[PDB]
């Protein structure tokens, strides 16, 4: 927007590590799935 | 020889010679491409500037500016900087109608010259006279710090509103167009005075947006000069300069978010 | 030292028993005086082994602590501290940073020397085993009486007694002896009861009757000796301090290791001090010299390679384990695999340690048993009615009987009350016609004579099972030849007929045959007696010949020996396949040792001995070209008058080595010999006469049923099962690690490269630092460490088995065309990528390229809180910190992205992936760990306080995609070439 564009100076960290610690999690349960494949 | 044959020594200089040469043009290739998708007017983020820092002249050795009065050579340090950002605001620098504008002599409002674009030549940027900042060689005795915000490209600082209490409780509040700063320290032993444009202890909201150097270069910036004339002496005191506003925020970290951090002392 | 007990004993079993009492200043008869024994004790000390002085664990811990790269890392470390003190005194520096990374690199050093003291560990008690042969307490003769005694208190002199069951005390001249038979297995590995008696009867001592032997135990009997040698003087005792004093060395696989360090530590001191000096020239303050050269250690030690090669090997290990073979060194596991050549011990190693019927000579025909634990043959006969007679005379003739309770275990393994032909002879019956005690219930036994000496004989007379007749059967065994002029007829298919030359001589044809096999030949007949001349109550005089034992029935030979186990034969062409060298070392007699060698393949068909052509051209043995001879058999005894200059040119000029009757010194002799010329020597063995040999062998191996607990003290590696196949399973093993190693070792120094170039651009650019020093030790010590153990799962690229020995001279772990793939064309290809999503922070955050040159200046200036950035924009102090670490973080990252491709690529050094495929399970689980660990590290809160690990935008990720890629292009394309030219150039510049 005009003189309210505060959101240009924004970012969504918070969201980004909630997204960023699911998949790592998610990454490291696939990985025990593929390794878990005979022991 | 070491390894190889002088026909050996040779090919495996043919080959890393075509090799290297191969990736630092693949190198520069990706470096192209990246280019290719950024602004010339405006950078991509600007999430890690967002709250604009504080920042003034006197170059603190660490965060401290400590002198003798009774001696020349003791502030000549602070003086060379303090120099050399006001030498910037000269009116011999600022001459005819371009780039330059007489803008309001008093805090007024925002300015908009369109959009991030070169569809204009260089956008004129506000006249900022160092006659404004009365009372500042420099201060001897006592000195007189020049403060200023950080320029952020299509920032728009918001004062804050009376709508409920304040530090500096109503005094002087223009409201609508002035971005304060009000220094403190209990432990208040000193005398805090503030110059400025149209002599408000603030940063004029006319100077805003910020059009970055590629669409207003020679742009400038508006100081707001602080004098502390306290009448103690030989000891450290811990001043902190504080700015206000809507887009204004701190760090325990960062320091220097929005703020100053001056160990002055005259051991004179 | 050790020199002098490498050579044959010198004894005096020569003396007449009067002689020898008075160099031991003894009496025959009344003993030792109680004060001259006790005076003998002080003159000579005490009966009994000391161990040899061990190295505490103490200073073996610490001398890991000062390998190469500990050493550089603990320079780092006090570099560290250094720069801490000089900032603790001049600016007062609030930060823990120096102070922290001192501490952090400190304990790198301390849990790294863990793992290489776990690698390097040395489980030997050798001299402990030797200690307990010797028995607590002895029986001695003194004033005239015999009493027990502490056999530590036995002297040179006494009068010793020892019955059957007891140890050999310490080593004694037979003066008096009844049916004496000794066990002397500890010197030969040959168990079978050798008698003693007071008589001298070999120049050789270790072969005579009238010599006792501590380490050996009486078996039978009774015997008196005089004692004239004690602990560490007796023959044994010499060679506990032998094998207990033999210098280790090092294995093949620390050799490699230490290489590998110089390497790495070389180039490490040079680029560390080549850009100490190249930044002090560009104006840098020591206060910051120091600091890069820290970062440049960091950078150049590959901080958990030593770790992940421990960890390899030790995996590498657990799959052996479940083979049943126990590596007690962790090392062990990859000098098999290095192994050019291989000296085994014959009884209870190549063979099954048991007398077995090998072969019958019955219907004028040679019928071969199954020798076989397992029973892995086929059949030979069970139709002919003379199988039935000779059968039932091996069942009958035969005082053998098997112990109690083993009914559940198999025939062939069960324990037996006898000597060792009768119980081979109640095994073979008992396997093919079912239980013996059933046979010798059917016909009772009612007069026997036991085997004499002098009849050569033994006979039984039986009431035969059938009711018809009821009547009384003679059988009788014994040597081929007396049976044969006892006999008048032969069982032929079922019916007699007269013993005709014809058939005489085919027996004397049959009997040379068996008996050139190496095998011991028995006699069998019987003779069914007239009912008319031998009423139901008939008494039979065992005394007094009462009954004929002439012009009986001939019904057949039968033929034995120690066999080889099933596995073996199989197993020695398996290593020969493989190009290693296979040697016979035994204590056993030459004919037998060179039949085993050709039945299991030492000596191939048509090979010949120097007397083999003597013998055939039957011409004089100095008439023949001993080059015409590939094969050879070396008698202990010709050995001995051999200097090793000799014994080298018989390793030198035959292919085909058998030494026989050697001594446990001469086995550690030839095993010196052939690591002499240069090779790496397995030993495998399970006597103590193995010891010597086992400890200086590269590698020694050890069976684990039938071994003797010396041996197993001796050896790295143990075969549980005594499965011989498991030395094939482990040479494979150990080439596949070798080179696996390679791939691991290639892959973690590859991301040095990424590591060590924004240090330097860091200088000659003075650009902002594009990577941390504790973001290194999150790659080396974190991300790298999964995937680099990973590789030691890879399986073959070829036939590994089909490829000779590395040449450990040439064919180094760690050479030029691995530094010049992972250093010179991979790694920096990874540190562009490294560098490009660098370029590609700071550009979108506002800091374009072209301005970062020579900005560090104002950068690192903690006073400027206003940089101007390319767009115009001031930036705070910790602001534009945030970005860098966010570098910092975005770097690292792209080091992992660009190891995923490096992974996949080091997974073969020759093949494609295409080719290979990707069945590693840890491999794939290793990438997925991996960047779980790498998006943990950034988006964990609080991460970014005690590492500098900041968020990364999605975007960040793709930034090295493309580096990735063209790492995984470039080494599919440079292996095709490999493959497509076999000629050399890419390989012979690259191939690891
Ligand atoms: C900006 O203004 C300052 C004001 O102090 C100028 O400083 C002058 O320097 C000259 C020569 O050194 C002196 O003779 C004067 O006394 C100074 N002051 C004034 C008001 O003229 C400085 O030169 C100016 N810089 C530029 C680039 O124009
Ligand atoms: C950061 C940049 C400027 C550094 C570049 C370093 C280059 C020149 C280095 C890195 C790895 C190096 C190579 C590594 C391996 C070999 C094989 C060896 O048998 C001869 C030297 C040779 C061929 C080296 C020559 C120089 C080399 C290519
Ligand atoms: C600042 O300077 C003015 C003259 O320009 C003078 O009148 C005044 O006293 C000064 N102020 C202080 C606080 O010293
Ligand atoms: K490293
Ligand atoms: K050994
Ligand atoms: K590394
Ligand atoms: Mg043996």
Redesign the interface.
Same mark, same amino acid.
């Given at each position: 927007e005009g003189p309210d564009n505060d959101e240009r100076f924004t970012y969504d960290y918070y969201r980004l590590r909630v997204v960023g610690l699911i998949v790592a999690a998610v990454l490291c349960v696939i990985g025990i799935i593929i390794l878990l494949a005979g022991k | 020889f070491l390894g190889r044959t002088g026909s050996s020594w040779f090919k495996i200089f043919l080959f890393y010679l075509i090799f290297y040469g191969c990736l630092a043009g693949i190198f520069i290739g990706t470096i192209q491409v990246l280019l290719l998708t950024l602004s010339d007017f405006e950078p991509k983020y600007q999430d890690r500037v967002a709250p604009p820092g504080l920042s003034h002249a006197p170059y603190a050795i660490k965060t401290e500016i400590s002198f003798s009065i009774s001696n020349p050579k003791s502030y000549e340090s602070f003086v060379k900087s303090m120099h050399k950002l006001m030498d910037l605001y000269n009116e011999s620098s600022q001459a005819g109608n371009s780039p330059f504008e007489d803008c309001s002599d008093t805090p007024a409002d925002y300015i908009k010259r369109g959009d991030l674009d070169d569809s204009q030549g260089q956008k004129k940027a506000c006249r900022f006279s160092r006659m404004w900042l009365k009372n500042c060689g420099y201060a001897e005795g006592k000195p007189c710090v020049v403060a200023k915000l950080n320029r952020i490209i299509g920032f728009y600082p918001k004062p804050l509103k009376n709508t409920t209490d304040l530090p500096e409780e109503l005094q002087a509040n223009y409201n609508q167009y002035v971005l304060p700063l009000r220094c403190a320290a209990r432990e208040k032993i000193g005398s805090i005075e503030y110059f400025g444009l149209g002599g408000y202890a603030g940063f004029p909201l006319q100077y805003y947006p910020y059009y970055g150097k590629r669409l207003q270069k020679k742009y400038l910036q508006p100081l707001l000069a602080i004098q502390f004339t306290n009448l103690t002496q030989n000891m450290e005191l811990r001043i902190e300069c504080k700015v206000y506003g809507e887009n204004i925020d701190y760090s325990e970290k960062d320091r220097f978010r929005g703020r100053f951090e001056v160990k002055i002392e005259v051991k004179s | 030292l050790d020199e002098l007990k490498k050579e044959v004993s010198m004894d005096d079993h020569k003396l007449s028993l009067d002689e020898l009492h008075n160099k031991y200043g003894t009496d025959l008869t009344r003993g030792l005086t109680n004060a001259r024994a006790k005076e003998i004790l002080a003159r000579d000390g005490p009966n009994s082994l000391t161990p040899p002085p061990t190295t505490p664990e103490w200073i073996k811990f610490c001398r890991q602590l000062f390998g190469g790269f500990s050493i550089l890392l603990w320079i780092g470390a006090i570099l560290c501290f250094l720069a801490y003190g000089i900032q603790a005194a001049t600016?007062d520096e609030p930060a823990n940073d120096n102070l922290y990374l001192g501490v952090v690199l400190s304990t790198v050093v301390i849990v790294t020397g863990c793992f290489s003291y776990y690698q390097e560990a040395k489980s030997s008690r050798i001299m402990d085993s030797f200690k307990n042969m010797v028995p607590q307490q002895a029986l001695v003769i003194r004033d005239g009486e015999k009493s027990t005694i502490n056999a530590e208190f036995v002297v040179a002199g006494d009068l010793v007694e020892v019955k059957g069951g007891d140890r050999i005390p310490a080593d004694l001249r037979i003066i008096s002896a009844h049916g004496c038979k000794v066990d002397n297995s500890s010197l030969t590995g040959e168990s079978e009861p050798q008698t003693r008696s007071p008589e001298f009867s070999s120049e050789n001592p270790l072969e005579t009757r009238n010599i006792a032997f501590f380490s050996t135990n009486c078996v039978e009997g009774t015997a008196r000796g005089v004692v004239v040698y004690t602990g560490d003087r007796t023959v044994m005792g010499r060679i506990a301090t032998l094998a207990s004093g033999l210098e280790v060395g090092r294995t093949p696989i620390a050799i490699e290791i230490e290489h590998f360090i110089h390497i790495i530590t070389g180039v490490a001191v040079f680029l560390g001090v080549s850009f100490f000096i190249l930044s002090l020239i560009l104006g840098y303050s020591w206060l910051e010299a120091v600091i890069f050269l820290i970062g440049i250690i960091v950078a150049n030690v590959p901080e958990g390679l030593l770790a992940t090669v421990t960890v390899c090997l030790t995996l590498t290990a657990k799959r052996m384990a479940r083979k049943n073979c126990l590596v007690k060194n962790l090392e062990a596991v990859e000098t098999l695999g290095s192994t050019s050549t291989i000296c085994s011990d014959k009884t209870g190693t190549l063979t099954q340690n048991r007398m077995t019927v090998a072969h019958m000579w019955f219907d004028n025909q040679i019928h071969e048993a199954d020798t076989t634990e397992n029973q892995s043959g086929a059949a030979f006969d069970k139709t002919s009615a003379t199988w039935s007679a000779l059968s039932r005379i091996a069942a009958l003739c035969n005082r053998a009987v098997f112990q109690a309770g083993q009914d559940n275990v198999p025939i062939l393994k069960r324990s037996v009350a006898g000597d060792a032909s009768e119980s081979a002879l109640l095994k073979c019956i008992e396997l093919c016609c079912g239980s013996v005690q059933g046979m010798r219930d059917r016909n009772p036994k009612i007069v026997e004579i036991p085997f004499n000496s002098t009849n050569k004989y033994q006979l039984s007379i039986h009431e035969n099972e059938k009711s018809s007749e009821s009547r009384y059967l003679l059988v009788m065994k014994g040597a081929p030849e007396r049976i044969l002029d006892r006999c008048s007829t032969i069982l032929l298919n079922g019916a007699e007929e007269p013993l005709k030359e014809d058939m005489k001589e085919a027996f004397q044809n049959a009997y040379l045959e068996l008996g050139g096999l190496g095998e011991r030949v028995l006699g069998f007949c019987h003779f069914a007696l007239p009912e008319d001349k031998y009423n139901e109550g008939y008494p039979f005089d065992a005394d007094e010949p009462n009954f004929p034992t002439t012009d009986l029935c001939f019904v057949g030979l039968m033929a034995m020996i120690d066999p080889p186990r099933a596995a073996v034969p199989d197993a020695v062409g398996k290593c020969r396949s493989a190009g290693i060298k296979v040697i016979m070392v035994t204590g056993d007699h030459p004919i037998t040792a060179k039949a085993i060698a050709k039945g299991v393949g030492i000596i191939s068909e048509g090979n010949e001995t120097i007397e083999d052509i003597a013998a055939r051209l039957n011409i004089p043995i100095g008439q023949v070209n001993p080059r015409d001879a590939k094969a050879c058999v070396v008698h202990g005894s010709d050995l001995k008058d051999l200097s090793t200059e000799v014994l080298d040119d018989i390793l030198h000029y035959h292919t085909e080595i058998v030494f026989a009757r050697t001594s446990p010194q001469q086995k550690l002799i030839i095993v010196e010999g052939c690591q002499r010329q240069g090779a790496i020597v397995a030993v495998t063995g399970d006597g103590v006469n193995d010891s010597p040999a086992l400890k200086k062998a590269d590698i020694g191996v050890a069976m684990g049923i039938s071994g003797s607990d010396v041996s197993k003290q001796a050896a790295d590696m143990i075969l549980l099962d005594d499965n011989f196949a498991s030395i094939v399973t482990g040479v494979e093993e150990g080439r596949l690690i070798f080179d696996n190693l390679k791939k691991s070792i290639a892959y973690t120094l590859t991301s040095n490269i990424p590591e060590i170039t924004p240090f330097l651009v860091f200088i000659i650019g003075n650009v902002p630092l594009p990577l941390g020093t504790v973001t290194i030790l999150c790659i080396d010590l974190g991300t790298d460490m999964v995937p680099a153990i990973s590789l030691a799962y890879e399986q073959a690229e070829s036939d590994i088995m089909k490829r000779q020995p590395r040449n450990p001279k040439t064919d180094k772990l760690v050479n030029?065309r691995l530094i010049s793939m992972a250093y010179?064309?991979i790694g920096?290809?990874q540190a &562009?990528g490294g560098?490009?999503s660098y370029?590609?922070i700071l550009?979108?955050?506002?800091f374009?390229?072209m301005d970062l040159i020579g900005k560090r200046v104002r950068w690192d200036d903690?006073?400027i809180?206003?940089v101007?950035?390319?767009?115009?924009?001031?930036?705070?102090?910790?602001?534009r910190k945030?970005?860098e670490f966010?570098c910092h973080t975005s770097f690292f990252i792209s080091i992992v992205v660009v190891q995923w491709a490096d992974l996949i690529i080091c997974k073969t050094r020759r093949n494609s992936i295409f080719q290979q495929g990707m069945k590693n399970?840890?491999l794939?689980?290793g990438?997925?760990?991996e960047?779980?660990?790498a998006?943990?590290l950034?988006?964990?809160?609080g991460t970014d306080v005690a590492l500098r690990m900041y968020? &990364?935008?999605?975007s960040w990720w793709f930034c090295a995609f493309?580096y990735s890629l063209?790492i995984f292009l470039y080494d599919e394309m440079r292996r095709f070439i490999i493959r497509r030219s076999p000629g050399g150039?890419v390989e012979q510049?690259t191939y690891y």
């Open positions: - | - | 600016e030029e010179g064309q920096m290809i &562009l560098f490009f370029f590609v550009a979108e955050n506002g374009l390229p903690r006073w809180s206003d101007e950035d390319s767009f115009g924009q001031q930036w705070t102090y910790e602001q945030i970005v966010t399970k840890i794939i689980f990438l997925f760990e960047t779980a660990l998006a943990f950034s988006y964990c809160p968020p &990364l935008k999605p493309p063209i150039w510049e």
